[PDB]
């Protein structure tokens, strides 16, 4: 369940209508980690298996804990990897609506990548969900260059990374319920807002 490469494996002749790109947290397995599979299952229920492609950020993104301390909250190599996936999606399936998400270091990675993205592609991301957003305070709860209405941040009371620290406390590991309900609910709503039904 933890590794999904639907975009990379996908047939360009039969593109999905929705493409979800997700970055896992530090030290998590596969390319989806602990929260990604839950979101994926709910998206599949809403759009159907052939209706949505789930793509985790693997490759150069090693999800190394120490990289949380770098300027952008992740490595340059990781940002290049996620940018490349958005670019692959845009090229392979130009008519698909994109959605994105990230947890912890992955949330910083998603924010950094989206900020650097060519605006024509960035504008195709109908909604983005961030859990335990490590740059929440620094970025004032926003993703630079991306609208607030398309952004949903899940930052628990007591999760120190949302408050400008890099300390990992218990609330940082409590996003399970959010990934099973409100997060996919938000993504589905944002996709339907622009695609209709």
Gist of the model:
With 197 residues, the chain is α/β, with parallel strands linked by helices.
Topology:
Layout: H1 6-9, E1 18-23, H2 36-47, E2 52-56, H3 76-92, E3 97-103, H4 105-116, H5 119-122, E4 125-131, E5 151-154, H6 176-180, H7 182-195
Parallel strand pairs: 1-2, 1-3, 3-4, 4-5
Helix pairs in contact: 2-7, 3-4
By CATH, the superfamily comes out as: Alpha/Beta hydrolase fold, catalytic domain
Q: What profile does the largest beta sheet have?
A: 5 strands, parallel
Main structural class: alpha/beta
Order of helices and strands: HEHEHEHHEEHH
**Portion in beta strands:** 5-15%
Number of helices: 7
Strand order of the largest sheet: 2-1-3-4-5
Q: Give me the CATH architecture, please.
A: 3-Layer(aba) Sandwich
Can you identify the CATH class?
A: Alpha Beta
Total domain units: 1
- Cα Rg: 15 Å
At CATH level 3, the topology is: Rossmann fold
Shape: globular
The count of DSSP E runs of length 2 or more, i.e. the number of strands, is: 5
Tell me the span between the first and last alpha carbons.
Answer: 28 Å
State the share of residues found in helices, binned by percent: 25-40%
Organism: Fusarium vanettenii (Neocosmospora pisi)
Keywords: Disulfide bond, Glycoprotein, Hydrolase, Secreted, Serine esterase, Signal, Virulence
Catalytic activity: cutin + H2O = cutin monomers
Site (Transition state stabilizer): 26, 105
